[PDB]
């Protein structure tokens, strides 16, 4: 199932999640969040789906919690170090890690790594820059930081980490700058998706192949998105809610690498920018 969690609907911050199955072709409402969470990150660990981070609506959160679809409950974990909204979070090597974002004053290039057999956080290598709106995935067994916002520019660069080494190294930077991007990786490429470039809101996407070290455009999303979450399923790259440049959406498409096509999915249950998604 794609989870969609949080995010804000044009008017409120949203602890509300619903989740949609491919085979009924049918958005299911789901136990909401202890609190609103938009700018969110959300991956799967464990068989659990950890909501992290966010804005609930007045503060920037360094809480996050954990849904059990087999009991159907939510818990919290430890907090983060810092608050972090604009978050990017990603699972590698059986951890969760919580990437950049804004802790409510400033923008971060810090970022920390989850065991869930310990349930303790710890600090990992700074990116080489602040990021918050950033995407964060792994391929290879690296950790992606892609685009965001450095506190002044929106970014077209983007690095990857290496636990093996303790180092991050920068790669090819994107066509564009991207920050409220959703990254993924599908068929061994890296995708980068929608966002903001500083100027304009993006229907745009690129993929990166680390074996030949190349970015190429890949066919444009119907509308643009920025605050988007991205995730795979089926094999097929889903994109979901964000914002147009005018709209808050409840949209969403999925991409079949092999048609190099887009197609409408079922729409959410309420417009979602600021969303986290994630398949369990």
């Not at 290879?140 to 892609?146: K, M, N, P, Q, R």
């Amino acid at each position: 199932l794609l989870y969609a969690v949080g995010g804000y609907d044009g008017n409120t911050h949203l602890n509300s999640l619903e989740c949609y199955n491919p085979e009924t072709n049918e958005w299911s409402p789901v136990a909401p969040l202890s609190v609103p969470r938009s700018g969110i990150g959300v991956a799967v660990l464990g068989g659990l789906l950890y909501a992290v981070g966010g804005y609930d609506g007045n503060t920037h959160l360094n809480s996050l919690e954990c849904y059990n679809p087999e009991t159907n409950e939510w818990s919290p974990v430890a907090p983060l170090s810092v608050p972090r909204s604009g978050i990017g979070v990603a699972v590698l090597g059986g951890l969760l890690y919580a990437v950049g974002g804004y802790d409510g004053n400033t923008h971060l290039n810090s970022l920390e790594c989850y065991n869930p057999e310990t349930n303790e956080w710890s600090p990992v290598a700074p990116l080489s820059v602040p990021r918050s709106g950033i995407g964060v995935a792994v391929l290879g067994g690296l950790l992606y930081a892609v685009g965001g916002y450095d506190g002044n520019t929106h970014l077209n660069s983007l690095e990857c980490y290496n636990p093996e080494t303790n180092e991050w190294s920068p790669v090819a930077p994107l066509s564009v700058p991207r920050s409220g991007i959703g990254v993924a990786v599908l068929g061994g490429l890296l995708y980068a998706v929608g966002g903001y470039d500083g100027n304009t809101h993006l229907n745009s996407l690129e993929c990166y192949n680390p074996e030949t070290n190349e970015w190429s455009p890949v066919a444009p999303l119907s509308v643009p998105r920025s605050g988007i979450g991205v995730a795979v399923l089926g094999g097929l790259l889903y994109a979901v809610g964000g914002y147009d440049g005018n709209t808050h959406l409840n949209s969403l498409e999925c991409y079949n690498p092999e048609t190099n096509e887009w197609s409408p999915v079922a729409p959410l249950s309420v417009p979602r920018s600021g969303i986290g998604v994630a398949v369990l």
